[PDB]
């Protein structure tokens, strides 16, 4: 499988002298770090959140990010003042693993406006024109440019390889779905609920014998709080037609033995 590693920063500025920056880190759909505004240190949410990095290497990366966080905050409030509140900024930075590609995207007020690409920061077509000046200034700083290039080209994929080794048990865990049926002139909506499965890929279908019911309407994948997934699939049926229907669930954890529940 091809994992996406993403570091997500969320910065809110309410006025001068109020902002917070909170970050979370995800490897695929498993959280590996949290870094709260009021916490000085990055918090591990897995045993293996350090990957293969040494205590010394990690400690200095933490300190580097600590200075980034303070620096970022001061620069945005300056940028705003040198030119309205409230301001929301989001950064999504990480790498997608095949080989791998890296990304660093920035959104302002909920909208994608800037990426780092190759060796420089670039505004995206349609971004506000006032960004051109500060981005040109940011691009004048070769230190940060080289530092970002190193983080994206080298450090990200390197770090993620270590995470995959160190987190193998959790990353490759199998948890079984448990399913149940419920239902809400004459027409009925049958609901097949499937909860507690991991990993995410799953197959759920209403069946009449070996015939798939094409009215099966799959909902979105919803998270449980215990790093498992929830999904439901509905079927609208006329009165009487309910007889003979089944919900069939296929999942990697089930060893080839599908769940079939009969309405």
């Amino acid at each position: 499988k091809n994992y996406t590693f993403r570091c997500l920063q969320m910065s809110s500025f309410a006025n001068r002298s109020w902002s917070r920056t909170d970050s979370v880190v995800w490897l695929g759909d498993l959280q590996t770090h949290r870094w709260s505004n009021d916490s000085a240190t990055i918090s591990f949410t897995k045993p293996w959140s350090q990957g293969k990095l040494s205590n010394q290497q990690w400690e200095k990366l933490q300190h580097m990010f600590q200075v980034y966080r303070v620096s970022f905050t001061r620069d945005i409030q300056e940028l705003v003042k040198m030119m309205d509140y409230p301001i929301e900024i989001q950064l999504s930075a990480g790498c997608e693993m095949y080989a791998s590609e890296s990304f660093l995207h920035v959104a302002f007020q909920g909208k994608y406006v800037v990426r780092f690409w190759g060796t420089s920061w670039q505004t995206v077509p349609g971004a506000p024109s006032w960004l051109d000046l500060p981005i040109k200034v940011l691009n004048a700083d070769q230190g940060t440019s080289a530092t970002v290039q190193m983080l994206l080209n080298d450090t990200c994929p390197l770090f993620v390889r270590g995470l995959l080794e160190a987190g193998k048990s959790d990353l490759e865990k199998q948890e079984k779905p448990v399913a149940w049926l419920s239902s809400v002139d004459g027409h009925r909506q049958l609901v097949c609920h499937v909860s507690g499965f991991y990993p995410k890929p799953v197959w759920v279908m209403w069946m009449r014998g070996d015939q798939e019911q094409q009215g099966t309407h799959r909902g979105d994948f919803l998270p449980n709080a215990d790093e498992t997934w929830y999904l439901q699939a509905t079927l609208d049926v006329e009165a009487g037609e309910e007889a003979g229907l089944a919900c069939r669930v296929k999942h990697s954890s089930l060893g080839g033995q599908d769940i079939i529940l009969y309405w």
């Binding site: 200095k60 580097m64 200075v67 300056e78 940060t144 530092t147 190193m150 983080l151």
Partner: peptide, 16 residues
């Protein structure tokens, strides 16, 4: 300017 971040990246270039 982005003054502080530029000062950050200049100090933590040497570590990386």
């Amino acid at each position: 300017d982005f003054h502080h971040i530029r000062e950050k990246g200049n100090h933590w270039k040497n570590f990386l």
